[PDB]
Each structure stands twice: as C-alpha cells, then as structure tokens.
Amino acid sequence: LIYTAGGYFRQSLSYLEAYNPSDGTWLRLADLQVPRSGLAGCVVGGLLYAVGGRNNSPDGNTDSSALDCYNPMTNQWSPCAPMSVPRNRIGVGVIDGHIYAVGGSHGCIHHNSVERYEPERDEWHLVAPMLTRRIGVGVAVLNRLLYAVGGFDGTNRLNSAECYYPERNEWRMITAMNTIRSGAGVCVLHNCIYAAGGYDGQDQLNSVERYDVETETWTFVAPMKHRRSALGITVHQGRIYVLGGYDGHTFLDSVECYDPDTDTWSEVTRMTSGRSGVGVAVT
C-alpha cells in the first residue's frame, strides 16, 4: 500500500505506516531499526528498501551510510551492506531491480557520488558521478533511464536536471525545469516526470510541473494548495499522492491527491502526525 518510512517531527522517526485510499485507513508495522529522516524508499522484488538519511535526535545527528531491507510477509528488517558514504537527503531510483543511490550530504560534503545496489547480491558498487553536487535531489525512472532532478549543491538551489544512461555509464544535462526545486517530490505519472513542491531558496512551493521526454519540455499543471518541501511522493491508482513535508511553519500531516485527467488536487487524508522528510514506496 502507500507506506511512509522514517520522517521527522521534532526528531527523526522510526514510524512505518501504510495508507490505502480504497479503504481509507493505515496499517502499522515494524518500526525502523535506526530512526531516519531525509531517507528514500523504494521497492525491489516486493521488498521495501530504506536508503540513507540521518538520525537527528536529542543526542546526535548521524548521517546514515546504511541500507536496510523490509520483508512484507517476513515483517523483518535486515541490514544490507552500507553505502560508499553516508547520504542525508538522498535520492533513489530503481532500474532493472537494481537501486541507484544519488547524491545526498555527509556533514558539509554535498555529494555528486552515485552508487548502485544489487538485491540478489547485497553489494554496493561505485558508479559515475553526477555533473552536479545534489542533496534533496529528486530521482525518477523513465524508459530505464535514471533522472536526477533539482536539489541543492550547498550554495544554490537547482532547476537543472541530468540523465544517467546506464549502459554507457554517463550523465548528460537535459532541459532545466521552469522552477528551482530542492526537496521536491519527484515521481513518474503517465509518462511525464513530475516535480511537485520543493523549496526555491525563499518559499515552499505549491506549483507542480512535468517533463515530456519526446519534446524535452517542462509544463506546469494544477498546483497543490499547500506549499511543501521535504514531502514524500508516490503514484497510486494512476493518481498522485504527496505526503506531509514542511511549509516554513508547520510539519504537514496533509496528504494531497492529484487527478491528472481532471488536473485537480484534493485532500485524501491527514497523516497520523505531521512530519517531513519521509521515504515512500509501495509493494
């Protein structure tokens, strides 16, 4: 269902929760081993993976090198070998049932580093670095191409996007978005790369825009009516769901729903608690 692992509401969270819109209710499961915020979630071969993040607690602020693996009928987390480096505000994509870990920070260091994980093998292997250092980068998969979108290089927030070609192991810059976006929600809906909300350096954004690969074009769609960055994002029902985040004053519990064929947003639920920086994925 629509799960949300980790997050932050005054401290990094252990929560693992589900939400289905066909039943309108939530299923709770095994808390994260280590609390995490700024993580990313994915699903490979059924299993929900949690990559990077950090544990921002009253007693520390540790960037997470770790990849951990949840089994929906084993309901157990098990550690899968750590990454090259810790990656707070990481972005992840899934090609070929393999996981790419993109960017993120470790302390002052803003990564361009990228690396890939192999679920049959439990191994991480360094790959070609991005052209840009990116934290809060959003990541998407289209035609088994991997897109790194937006983010923050440590000084500037980014509207640039760049494409990873796996069988040439290359990054090439593509057309920039119309809006600068760091910590936006980036997903794939229809066959457009969606980028929703984020932070442009001044305000959280309610605007949303989508990339069409054939025309190399970004187009703005209906905006959410709550600006939000550090949101979770996923598509269920062929419909967009955005989960929590931060709006400058409050940790949102609002969950919004975008219908593409009417191009309208509508509130589906409120989360159990307002929180930001969750990892989302579905299996």
Binding site: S37, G38, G136, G183, Y199, S229, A230, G248, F251, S276
Partner: peptide
C-alpha cells in the same frame, strides 16, 4: 534546519 525540511 535545513529550511526545506524544518529540522
């Protein structure tokens, strides 16, 4: 702290 995440 990061103003994008509020932490």
């Amino acid at each position: 702290x990061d103003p994008e995440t509020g932490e």
